[PDB]
Amino acid sequence: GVGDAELRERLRQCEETIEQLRAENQELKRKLNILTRPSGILVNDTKLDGPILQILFMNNAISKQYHQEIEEFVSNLVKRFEEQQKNDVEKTSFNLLPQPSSIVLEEDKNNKEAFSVVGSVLYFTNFCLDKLGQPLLNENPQLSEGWEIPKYHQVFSHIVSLEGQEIQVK
Amino acid sequence: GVGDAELRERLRQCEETIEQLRAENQELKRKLNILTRPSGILVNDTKLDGPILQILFMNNAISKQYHQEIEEFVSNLVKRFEEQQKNDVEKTSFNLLPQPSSIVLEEDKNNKEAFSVVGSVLYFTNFCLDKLGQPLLNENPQLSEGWEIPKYHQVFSHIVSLEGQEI
Amino acid sequence: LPFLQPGRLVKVKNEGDDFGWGVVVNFSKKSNVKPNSGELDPLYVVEVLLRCSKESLKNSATEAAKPAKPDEKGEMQVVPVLVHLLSAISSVRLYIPKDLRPVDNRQSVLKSIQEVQKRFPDGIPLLDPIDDMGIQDQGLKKVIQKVEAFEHRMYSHPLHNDPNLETVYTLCEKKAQIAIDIKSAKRELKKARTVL
């Protein structure tokens, strides 16, 4: 009796908990509309098919009158990559993903090597808001395709380590 | 007894399902933060002090070897913007907002003019997967930022209609 | 109106024929000059690039109609259409040439609409009325509920799974049209000499 009533109350509470969770798993995909991944596409390649990049044009930005130079620029990149296809050399030039957050799929083939956000930044007048970084090859920034190191003098022979951990760098 | 045990098993199964939904929600949290809203940002130059774009780089050799000219391009775009003055060319038409989907406000009052993203397009090198359209004033789509109309000849002189109201 | 950029791949059917898929070129709120029987609502004209027939272009003054037939290769031209004829809005924006007005670039546009159809064999994703536009008007929820209900029981029907459904559909359409014809003929015959 009392135990049965307690069990029924617990079951009702659990169902309500799921409702809250059911409600969130319904109101999230609403804001997630921006990401589309529309339907079944047929990507017979992974180095020339698939998207390039997703731009979120910002409001209250007087810099939106440039809506054409961006498009023509991102269109001339593919034709320049075609005219600069390669100086044919055998190299894998493979890359992995630091952050696996792929765009959602509301489509009721490939979905891993494509439709995967690799980097997202939020440009400012001078700032940036990177949180995912460029993917690396063998943890060495000296041969990657995107990174580019500035020039500097570097006369600071021998680091200051912590407590008794002097390391003879050179 | 047996009925009580079955009820307990059903309750446990329901709890396990609840846990899975909670884990899925915690996962989808990641996706609902790439929008980003660090905190309340101090801005003064309303509509001139704030983000300009938000590029989401995608897995493709073009978007991970040609990266640096994209950054120099956004840079040269932000610099070339400040060499016009003594003009009213910013909106010039009272360009009210289209119907946006505002980025979630992360808390970690004021600023009702907030980000309110106003578009998104996917490039596949032979088309464009647009959404959210593009802002423009009440009418007259030739006095707004954007909308570069091509040149056509308009050889026809009789508009199609359902019945009547012919040109 | 904010969804009418050049390349939107609209569809047009003014109850007579299918033109196909075509890219939008321009649009305007041009009102009725010299309004016949007055004017109280504004109309909009969309200048959109369809695929017309050779016979339609050779005169190009009678009705601006009769798109090309599957037995002819046809030629594409920009045609003005009414706003209330757009039976489908897509979510794809083919790139448009610069300054145009020849033949070859329109042929490339034809080629482009031809590969893009070779990428969504299921069907081009057009739009979602609930979210993409941003409608917050009371009542549309009722109609979407009703459409979801009707299609739910539709597929929930066994006949749907059964084959030869199309043949029976055509038969029923034919007999319904015969019934309509007989109704109209009896309506006319009910006035052969009736208080004329």
Secondary element (H or E) of residue B130: strand B128-131
Beta carbons of C122 and A75 less than 8 Å apart? no
Chain A residue with minimum CA distance to B133: A57
Q: How many CB atoms lie within 10 A of CB C132?
A: 19
Residue C11 pairs in a beta bridge with: C21, C88
Cα separation of B137 and B143, whole Å? 8
Q: How many CB atoms lie within 10 A of CB C76?
A: 21
Cα separation of A122 and B36, whole Å? 9
Q: Is the CA virtual torsion A22, A28, A30, A34 positive or negative?
A: negative
Beta carbons of C94 and B126 less than 8 Å apart? yes
Beta carbons of C14 and B160 less than 8 Å apart? yes
Cα separation of A33 and A26, whole Å? 12
Chain C residue with minimum CA distance to B99: C134
- CB contact, 8 Å: B72 with chain A? no
Cα separation of B148 and C138, whole Å? 36
Rounded to the nearest angstrom, the minimum Cα separation between C128 and chain A is 10
Instruction: From B93, B111, B91, B89, select the one nearest B41 (Cα to Cα).
Output: B111
The SS3 call for residue B157 is coil
Q: How many CB atoms lie within 10 A of CB A149?
A: 7
Percent of chain B as helix, strand, coil, to the nearest 5:
30, 5, 65
Q: Which two tokens mark A86?
A: 């390669």
Instruction: From B90, B165, A118, select the one nearest C35 (Cα to Cα).
Output: B165
Beta carbons of A40 and C125 less than 8 Å apart? no
Size of interface A-C (CB pairs under 8 A): 21
Beta carbons of A42 and C91 less than 8 Å apart? no
Interface test with C, best of B121, B144, B160 (most C CBs within 10 A): B160
Cα separation of C27 and B133, whole Å? 15
> Are A103 and B59 in contact, with CB atoms under 8 Å apart?
no
Give chains near A: 3+ CB pairs under 8 A.
B, C
Beta carbons of C122 and A39 less than 8 Å apart? yes
> Which burial class, exposed, middle or buried, applies to A53 when counting CB atoms under 10 A from its CB (0-12, 13-18, 19+)?
buried
Cα separation of C2 and B98, whole Å? 8
Resolution in A: 4.5
- Order of strands, edge to edge, in the sheet holding C45-52? C75-82, C45-52, C21-28, C10-12, C86-88
Interface test with A, best of B39, B45, B48, B53 (most A CBs within 10 A): B53
> Are C91 and C112 in contact, with CB atoms under 8 Å apart?
no
Rounded to the nearest angstrom, the minimum Cα separation between B142 and chain C is 9
Rounded to the nearest angstrom, the minimum Cα separation between C64 and chain B is 6
Cα separation of B167 and C36, whole Å? 11
> Are A134 and A146 in contact, with CB atoms under 8 Å apart?
yes
Rounded to the nearest angstrom, the minimum Cα separation between B123 and chain C is 10
The SS3 call for residue C66 is coil
Strands (DSSP E) found in C53-157: 75-82, 86-88
Cα separation of C60 and B67, whole Å? 51
At how many degrees (to 10) do helices A69-83 and B67-80 cross? 150
Name the interface residues of C facing A (CB cutoff 8 Å). Answer: 91, 95, 119-123, 125, 128, 131-132
Beta carbons of C120 and A30 less than 8 Å apart? no
> Are A57 and B131 in contact, with CB atoms under 8 Å apart?
no
Rounded to the nearest angstrom, the minimum Cα separation between C77 and chain A is 25
Q: Give the Å distances, CA to CA, from A90 to A86, A87, A93, B64, C14.
A: 10, 10, 9, 19, 57
- Order of strands, edge to edge, in the sheet holding B128-131? A117-120, B55-58, A53-55, B120-123, B128-131
Cα separation of B15 and B75, whole Å? 52
Experimentally, the structure was elucidated by cryo-EM
Cα separation of B93 and B145, whole Å? 10
> Are A132 and A98 in contact, with CB atoms under 8 Å apart?
yes
> Are B123 and A52 in contact, with CB atoms under 8 Å apart?
yes
Size of interface A-B (CB pairs under 8 A): 223
- CB contact, 8 Å: B43 with chain A? no
Q: Which two tokens mark A38?
A: 């529309």
Rounded to the nearest angstrom, the minimum Cα separation between C117 and chain A is 11
Q: Which two tokens mark C120?
A: 């969504």
Cα separation of A118 and B55, whole Å? 11
Cα separation of C21 and B127, whole Å? 15
Cα separation of C23 and C44, whole Å? 17
Residues of A in contact with B115 (CB under 8 A): 58-60
Residue C77 pairs in a beta bridge with: C50
Interface test with A, best of C9, C116, C120 (most A CBs within 10 A): C120
Cα separation of C109 and C100, whole Å? 11
AA letter at B15: E
Cα separation of C4 and A134, whole Å? 36
Q: Which two tokens mark B155?
A: 């050889």
Beta carbons of C5 and B133 less than 8 Å apart? yes
DSSP A104: P
Residues of A in contact with C123 (CB under 8 A): 39
Q: Which two tokens mark C97?
A: 């040439």
Interface test with B, best of C23, C26, C83 (most B CBs within 10 A): C26
Q: Which residues of C40-63 are buried (b: 16+ CB within 10 A; e: fewer)?
A: eeebbbbbbbbbbbeebbeeeeee
